[PDB]
mmCIF file of C-alpha atoms and ligand atoms in Angstrom:
data_model
loop_
_atom_site.group_PDB
_atom_site.id
_atom_site.type_symbol
_atom_site.label_atom_id
_atom_site.label_comp_id
_atom_site.label_asym_id
_atom_site.label_seq_id
_atom_site.Cartn_x
_atom_site.Cartn_y
_atom_site.Cartn_z
ATOM 1 C CA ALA A 31 -25.292 29.726 3.147
ATOM 2 C CA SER A 32 -28.632 29.016 4.865
ATOM 3 C CA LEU A 33 -29.968 25.920 6.732
ATOM 4 C CA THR A 34 -31.063 24.180 3.509
ATOM 5 C CA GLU A 35 -27.673 25.137 2.000
ATOM 6 C CA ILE A 36 -25.809 23.676 5.000
ATOM 7 C CA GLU A 37 -27.952 20.528 5.264
ATOM 8 C CA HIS A 38 -27.814 19.909 1.502
ATOM 9 C CA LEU A 39 -24.020 20.335 1.683
ATOM 10 C CA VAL A 40 -23.847 17.699 4.468
ATOM 11 C CA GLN A 41 -25.995 15.124 2.632
ATOM 12 C CA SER A 42 -24.114 15.683 -0.625
ATOM 13 C CA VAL A 43 -20.618 15.200 0.910
ATOM 14 C CA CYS A 44 -21.755 12.025 2.709
ATOM 15 C CA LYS A 45 -23.261 10.685 -0.517
ATOM 16 C CA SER A 46 -20.079 11.528 -2.489
ATOM 17 C CA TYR A 47 -17.934 9.729 0.112
ATOM 18 C CA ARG A 48 -20.181 6.607 0.171
ATOM 19 C CA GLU A 49 -19.869 6.423 -3.623
ATOM 20 C CA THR A 50 -16.047 6.819 -3.591
ATOM 21 C CA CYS A 51 -14.902 5.203 -0.329
ATOM 22 C CA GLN A 52 -13.037 2.446 -2.296
ATOM 23 C CA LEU A 53 -13.486 -0.138 0.442
ATOM 24 C CA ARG A 54 -16.673 -0.611 2.430
ATOM 25 C CA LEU A 55 -16.242 -0.271 6.195
ATOM 26 C CA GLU A 56 -18.290 -3.473 6.668
ATOM 27 C CA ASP A 57 -15.925 -5.476 4.461
ATOM 28 C CA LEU A 58 -12.830 -4.008 6.187
ATOM 29 C CA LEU A 59 -14.211 -4.882 9.609
ATOM 30 C CA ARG A 60 -15.262 -8.396 8.458
ATOM 31 C CA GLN A 61 -11.744 -8.944 7.167
ATOM 32 C CA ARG A 62 -10.047 -8.117 10.505
ATOM 33 C CA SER A 63 -9.559 -11.817 11.378
ATOM 34 C CA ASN A 64 -7.962 -12.447 7.970
ATOM 35 C CA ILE A 65 -4.344 -11.802 9.083
ATOM 36 C CA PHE A 66 -1.109 -12.601 7.154
ATOM 37 C CA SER A 67 0.676 -15.735 8.448
ATOM 38 C CA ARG A 68 4.335 -15.752 9.625
ATOM 39 C CA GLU A 69 5.297 -17.204 6.233
ATOM 40 C CA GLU A 70 3.449 -14.535 4.252
ATOM 41 C CA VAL A 71 5.035 -11.715 6.304
ATOM 42 C CA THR A 72 8.468 -13.270 5.775
ATOM 43 C CA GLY A 73 7.574 -13.465 2.086
ATOM 44 C CA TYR A 74 6.907 -9.717 1.990
ATOM 45 C CA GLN A 75 10.067 -9.009 4.012
ATOM 46 C CA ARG A 76 12.195 -10.977 1.519
ATOM 47 C CA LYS A 77 10.916 -8.941 -1.437
ATOM 48 C CA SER A 78 13.168 -6.404 -2.998
ATOM 49 C CA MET A 79 12.895 -2.754 -1.985
ATOM 50 C CA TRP A 80 12.046 -2.226 -5.683
ATOM 51 C CA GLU A 81 9.183 -4.734 -5.760
ATOM 52 C CA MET A 82 7.737 -3.314 -2.512
ATOM 53 C CA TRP A 83 7.971 0.210 -3.995
ATOM 54 C CA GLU A 84 5.988 -1.012 -7.008
ATOM 55 C CA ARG A 85 3.271 -2.685 -4.879
ATOM 56 C CA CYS A 86 2.918 0.304 -2.544
ATOM 57 C CA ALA A 87 2.928 2.733 -5.505
ATOM 58 C CA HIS A 88 0.136 0.655 -7.040
ATOM 59 C CA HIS A 89 -1.830 0.731 -3.726
ATOM 60 C CA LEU A 90 -1.405 4.529 -3.531
ATOM 61 C CA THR A 91 -2.231 5.259 -7.177
ATOM 62 C CA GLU A 92 -5.537 3.367 -6.813
ATOM 63 C CA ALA A 93 -6.301 5.117 -3.484
ATOM 64 C CA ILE A 94 -5.563 8.523 -5.043
ATOM 65 C CA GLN A 95 -7.887 7.749 -7.986
ATOM 66 C CA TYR A 96 -10.862 7.348 -5.634
ATOM 67 C CA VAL A 97 -9.971 10.626 -3.845
ATOM 68 C CA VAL A 98 -9.950 12.434 -7.231
ATOM 69 C CA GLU A 99 -13.416 10.960 -7.822
ATOM 70 C CA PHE A 100 -14.537 12.134 -4.366
ATOM 71 C CA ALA A 101 -13.505 15.730 -5.205
ATOM 72 C CA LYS A 102 -15.278 15.696 -8.605
ATOM 73 C CA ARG A 103 -18.576 14.704 -6.959
ATOM 74 C CA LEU A 104 -18.226 17.700 -4.666
ATOM 75 C CA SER A 105 -20.344 20.510 -6.049
ATOM 76 C CA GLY A 106 -18.236 23.584 -5.381
ATOM 77 C CA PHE A 107 -14.982 21.804 -6.297
ATOM 78 C CA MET A 108 -16.069 21.639 -9.937
ATOM 79 C CA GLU A 109 -17.042 25.369 -9.797
ATOM 80 C CA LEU A 110 -13.394 26.316 -9.111
ATOM 81 C CA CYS A 111 -11.008 26.972 -12.028
ATOM 82 C CA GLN A 112 -8.796 24.188 -13.374
ATOM 83 C CA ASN A 113 -5.616 25.613 -11.853
ATOM 84 C CA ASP A 114 -7.218 25.662 -8.382
ATOM 85 C CA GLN A 115 -8.713 22.172 -8.695
ATOM 86 C CA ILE A 116 -5.207 20.867 -9.516
ATOM 87 C CA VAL A 117 -3.508 22.840 -6.738
ATOM 88 C CA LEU A 118 -5.959 21.419 -4.159
ATOM 89 C CA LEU A 119 -5.574 17.825 -5.386
ATOM 90 C CA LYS A 120 -1.754 18.021 -5.604
ATOM 91 C CA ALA A 121 -1.574 19.394 -2.087
ATOM 92 C CA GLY A 122 -4.383 17.353 -0.513
ATOM 93 C CA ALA A 123 -5.163 13.978 -2.168
ATOM 94 C CA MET A 124 -2.378 12.074 -0.357
ATOM 95 C CA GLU A 125 -3.409 13.804 2.888
ATOM 96 C CA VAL A 126 -6.934 12.375 2.352
ATOM 97 C CA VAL A 127 -5.509 8.887 1.586
ATOM 98 C CA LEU A 128 -3.581 9.164 4.893
ATOM 99 C CA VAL A 129 -6.829 9.934 6.737
ATOM 100 C CA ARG A 130 -8.863 7.244 4.805
ATOM 101 C CA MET A 131 -6.323 4.634 5.983
ATOM 102 C CA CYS A 132 -7.631 4.637 9.585
ATOM 103 C CA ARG A 133 -10.724 2.728 8.448
ATOM 104 C CA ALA A 134 -8.498 -0.079 7.116
ATOM 105 C CA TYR A 135 -6.494 0.023 10.373
ATOM 106 C CA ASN A 136 -7.066 -2.291 13.326
ATOM 107 C CA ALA A 137 -5.997 -0.676 16.581
ATOM 108 C CA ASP A 138 -6.407 -3.925 18.599
ATOM 109 C CA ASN A 139 -3.421 -5.583 16.896
ATOM 110 C CA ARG A 140 -1.810 -2.618 15.037
ATOM 111 C CA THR A 141 -2.461 -4.053 11.601
ATOM 112 C CA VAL A 142 -3.567 -2.539 8.283
ATOM 113 C CA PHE A 143 -5.410 -4.016 5.300
ATOM 114 C CA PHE A 144 -2.956 -4.593 2.460
ATOM 115 C CA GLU A 145 -3.279 -6.788 -0.663
ATOM 116 C CA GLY A 146 -6.116 -8.894 0.832
ATOM 117 C CA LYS A 147 -5.144 -9.375 4.485
ATOM 118 C CA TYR A 148 -4.297 -7.481 7.647
ATOM 119 C CA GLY A 149 -0.622 -7.102 8.473
ATOM 120 C CA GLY A 150 1.669 -5.237 10.853
ATOM 121 C CA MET A 151 4.214 -2.525 10.197
ATOM 122 C CA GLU A 152 6.937 -5.166 9.713
ATOM 123 C CA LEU A 153 5.349 -6.186 6.398
ATOM 124 C CA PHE A 154 7.017 -3.184 4.773
ATOM 125 C CA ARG A 155 10.548 -3.828 6.162
ATOM 126 C CA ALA A 156 12.266 -4.087 2.731
ATOM 127 C CA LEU A 157 11.415 -0.458 1.916
ATOM 128 C CA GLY A 158 13.841 0.700 4.641
ATOM 129 C CA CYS A 159 11.365 3.372 5.726
ATOM 130 C CA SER A 160 10.525 2.233 9.254
ATOM 131 C CA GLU A 161 10.356 5.676 10.859
ATOM 132 C CA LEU A 162 7.987 7.131 8.227
ATOM 133 C CA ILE A 163 5.775 3.975 8.205
ATOM 134 C CA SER A 164 5.746 4.005 12.001
ATOM 135 C CA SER A 165 4.461 7.619 12.034
ATOM 136 C CA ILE A 166 1.756 6.638 9.518
ATOM 137 C CA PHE A 167 0.722 3.750 11.786
ATOM 138 C CA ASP A 168 0.849 6.125 14.808
ATOM 139 C CA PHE A 169 -1.337 8.679 12.972
ATOM 140 C CA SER A 170 -3.962 5.997 12.080
ATOM 141 C CA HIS A 171 -3.736 4.750 15.679
ATOM 142 C CA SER A 172 -4.604 8.187 17.106
ATOM 143 C CA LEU A 173 -7.504 8.681 14.600
ATOM 144 C CA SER A 174 -8.959 5.238 15.375
ATOM 145 C CA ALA A 175 -9.416 6.287 19.060
ATOM 146 C CA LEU A 176 -12.028 8.783 17.784
ATOM 147 C CA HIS A 177 -14.179 6.056 16.225
ATOM 148 C CA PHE A 178 -15.051 8.242 13.228
ATOM 149 C CA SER A 179 -18.339 7.468 11.573
ATOM 150 C CA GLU A 180 -18.512 7.176 7.797
ATOM 151 C CA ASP A 181 -20.165 10.595 7.588
ATOM 152 C CA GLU A 182 -17.552 12.175 9.902
ATOM 153 C CA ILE A 183 -14.808 10.738 7.632
ATOM 154 C CA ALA A 184 -16.744 12.169 4.675
ATOM 155 C CA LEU A 185 -16.874 15.707 6.069
ATOM 156 C CA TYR A 186 -13.402 15.693 7.603
ATOM 157 C CA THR A 187 -11.705 14.566 4.374
ATOM 158 C CA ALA A 188 -13.711 17.197 2.424
ATOM 159 C CA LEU A 189 -12.149 19.762 4.779
ATOM 160 C CA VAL A 190 -8.640 18.303 4.268
ATOM 161 C CA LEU A 191 -9.159 18.828 0.511
ATOM 162 C CA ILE A 192 -10.940 22.205 0.410
ATOM 163 C CA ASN A 193 -8.307 24.362 2.142
ATOM 164 C CA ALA A 194 -7.739 27.964 1.006
ATOM 165 C CA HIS A 195 -4.241 28.129 2.466
ATOM 166 C CA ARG A 196 -2.688 26.129 -0.353
ATOM 167 C CA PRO A 197 -0.046 28.279 -2.150
ATOM 168 C CA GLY A 198 -0.753 28.863 -5.840
ATOM 169 C CA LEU A 199 -4.521 29.353 -5.761
ATOM 170 C CA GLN A 200 -5.843 32.027 -8.126
ATOM 171 C CA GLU A 201 -9.402 32.320 -6.783
ATOM 172 C CA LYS A 202 -8.487 32.186 -3.069
ATOM 173 C CA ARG A 203 -11.673 33.976 -1.813
ATOM 174 C CA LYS A 204 -13.882 31.423 -3.600
ATOM 175 C CA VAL A 205 -12.007 28.480 -2.034
ATOM 176 C CA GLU A 206 -12.183 30.210 1.386
ATOM 177 C CA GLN A 207 -15.982 30.494 1.032
ATOM 178 C CA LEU A 208 -16.249 26.784 0.179
ATOM 179 C CA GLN A 209 -14.019 25.881 3.140
ATOM 180 C CA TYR A 210 -16.058 28.085 5.588
ATOM 181 C CA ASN A 211 -19.296 26.447 4.459
ATOM 182 C CA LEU A 212 -17.844 22.968 4.897
ATOM 183 C CA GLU A 213 -16.568 23.890 8.390
ATOM 184 C CA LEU A 214 -20.051 25.075 9.426
ATOM 185 C CA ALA A 215 -21.705 21.999 7.786
ATOM 186 C CA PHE A 216 -19.298 19.718 9.691
ATOM 187 C CA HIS A 217 -19.918 21.510 13.027
ATOM 188 C CA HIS A 218 -23.671 21.468 12.390
ATOM 189 C CA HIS A 219 -23.756 17.753 11.635
ATOM 190 C CA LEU A 220 -21.745 16.937 14.739
ATOM 191 C CA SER A 221 -24.273 18.865 16.848
ATOM 192 C CA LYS A 222 -27.208 16.923 15.345
ATOM 193 C CA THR A 223 -25.401 13.633 16.145
ATOM 194 C CA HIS A 224 -24.162 14.686 19.602
ATOM 195 C CA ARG A 225 -20.535 14.316 18.546
ATOM 196 C CA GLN A 226 -19.258 17.844 19.259
ATOM 197 C CA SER A 227 -16.711 16.296 21.660
ATOM 198 C CA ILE A 228 -14.528 15.064 18.747
ATOM 199 C CA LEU A 229 -13.744 18.648 17.649
ATOM 200 C CA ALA A 230 -11.379 19.302 20.584
ATOM 201 C CA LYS A 231 -9.898 15.858 19.838
ATOM 202 C CA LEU A 232 -8.912 16.434 16.208
ATOM 203 C CA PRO A 233 -5.157 16.586 15.459
ATOM 204 C CA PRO A 234 -3.557 19.998 14.795
ATOM 205 C CA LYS A 235 -3.780 20.762 11.045
ATOM 206 C CA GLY A 236 0.028 20.840 10.809
ATOM 207 C CA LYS A 237 0.285 17.190 11.916
ATOM 208 C CA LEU A 238 -1.249 15.785 8.710
ATOM 209 C CA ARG A 239 0.548 18.275 6.417
ATOM 210 C CA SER A 240 3.851 17.547 8.156
ATOM 211 C CA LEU A 241 3.380 13.775 7.837
ATOM 212 C CA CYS A 242 2.411 14.160 4.196
ATOM 213 C CA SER A 243 5.474 16.337 3.444
ATOM 214 C CA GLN A 244 7.859 13.742 4.844
ATOM 215 C CA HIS A 245 5.863 11.100 2.934
ATOM 216 C CA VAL A 246 6.155 13.162 -0.279
ATOM 217 C CA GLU A 247 9.952 13.456 0.178
ATOM 218 C CA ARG A 248 10.444 9.692 0.390
ATOM 219 C CA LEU A 249 8.224 8.724 -2.572
ATOM 220 C CA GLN A 250 9.775 11.347 -4.838
ATOM 221 C CA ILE A 251 13.199 9.662 -4.338
ATOM 222 C CA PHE A 252 11.806 6.181 -5.072
ATOM 223 C CA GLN A 253 10.182 7.567 -8.231
ATOM 224 C CA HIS A 254 13.448 9.167 -9.386
ATOM 225 C CA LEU A 255 15.372 5.914 -8.708
ATOM 226 C CA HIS A 256 12.732 3.562 -10.175
ATOM 227 C CA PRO A 257 10.008 5.179 -12.331
ATOM 228 C CA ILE A 258 6.514 3.589 -12.265
HETATM 229 C C1 HKZ B 564 4.144 1.458 3.225
HETATM 230 C C2 HKZ B 564 3.493 2.808 3.051
HETATM 231 C C3 HKZ B 564 4.103 3.994 2.860
HETATM 232 C C4 HKZ B 564 5.557 4.483 2.788
HETATM 233 C C5 HKZ B 564 6.191 4.214 1.417
HETATM 234 C C6 HKZ B 564 5.417 3.886 0.295
HETATM 235 C C7 HKZ B 564 6.031 3.638 -0.956
HETATM 236 C C8 HKZ B 564 7.426 3.755 -1.042
HETATM 237 C C9 HKZ B 564 8.200 4.092 0.068
HETATM 238 C C10 HKZ B 564 7.558 4.315 1.313
HETATM 239 N N1 HKZ B 564 2.979 4.895 2.780
HETATM 240 C C11 HKZ B 564 1.905 4.230 2.894
HETATM 241 C C12 HKZ B 564 0.592 4.926 2.846
HETATM 242 C C13 HKZ B 564 -0.632 4.396 3.033
HETATM 243 C C14 HKZ B 564 -1.549 5.498 2.862
HETATM 244 C C15 HKZ B 564 -0.722 6.529 2.595
HETATM 245 O O1 HKZ B 564 0.568 6.255 2.566
HETATM 246 N N2 HKZ B 564 2.170 2.959 3.061
HETATM 247 C C16 HKZ B 564 1.228 1.991 3.227
HETATM 248 C C17 HKZ B 564 0.808 1.738 4.549
HETATM 249 CL CL1 HKZ B 564 1.555 2.575 5.897
HETATM 250 C C18 HKZ B 564 -0.186 0.783 4.781
HETATM 251 C C19 HKZ B 564 -0.775 0.079 3.681
HETATM 252 C C20 HKZ B 564 -0.344 0.374 2.381
HETATM 253 C C21 HKZ B 564 0.648 1.326 2.151
HETATM 254 CL CL2 HKZ B 564 1.164 1.660 0.488
#
């Protein structure tokens, strides 16, 4: 994986992210002053646990669809066998959605973009999942302190996805090789943009997996109780 291989890998990932980012950073930032009123928040809080589950499930389904598109536009991902493509997406797509959230998060007031406006944690009260949602907000809060660029988000989420340590892979060595190349491409791009300092500031890999596991547990129950 030479210099042209590494640089082409960078450009390609950043392109693929720009085409699949779902919401433009510019729009998200412009919308920061569009905040839910006290009445609108109360409105959300009065909703049934079942309605909130439906609305959040819809939000997540759509977010996941763009992540699946992101992976398909990654040359290398398509070269893997069908089993491995599915293993990576099952294990990683929600982890990517978790990371992608920090762009739609405003650290100044602790609000997130949801169904057209920015709103706090308390919007989701009816779900009865305050501890989980609080950890999600905390995770986005810590990421926002890094001020990730669009291209950094692009490369970092590619690395969340292309991880050879997912159980159930059949061509492990081939996924490893793709991961190693993406790691080098990420490091390389950070050096060219004088952003090497964020590397020591990235969360431990277990943090995101751990958050996602607990997230998986809760949504599996809601699905079993009230199928979408
Ligand atoms: C509320 C929520 C949950 C927990 C949950 C979801 C469904 C049923 C029960 C509990 N998870 C996410 C979430 C976003 C990104 C990944 O997960 N949210 C979420 C957040 Cl924190 C902010 C905006 C939009 C959404 Cl949907």
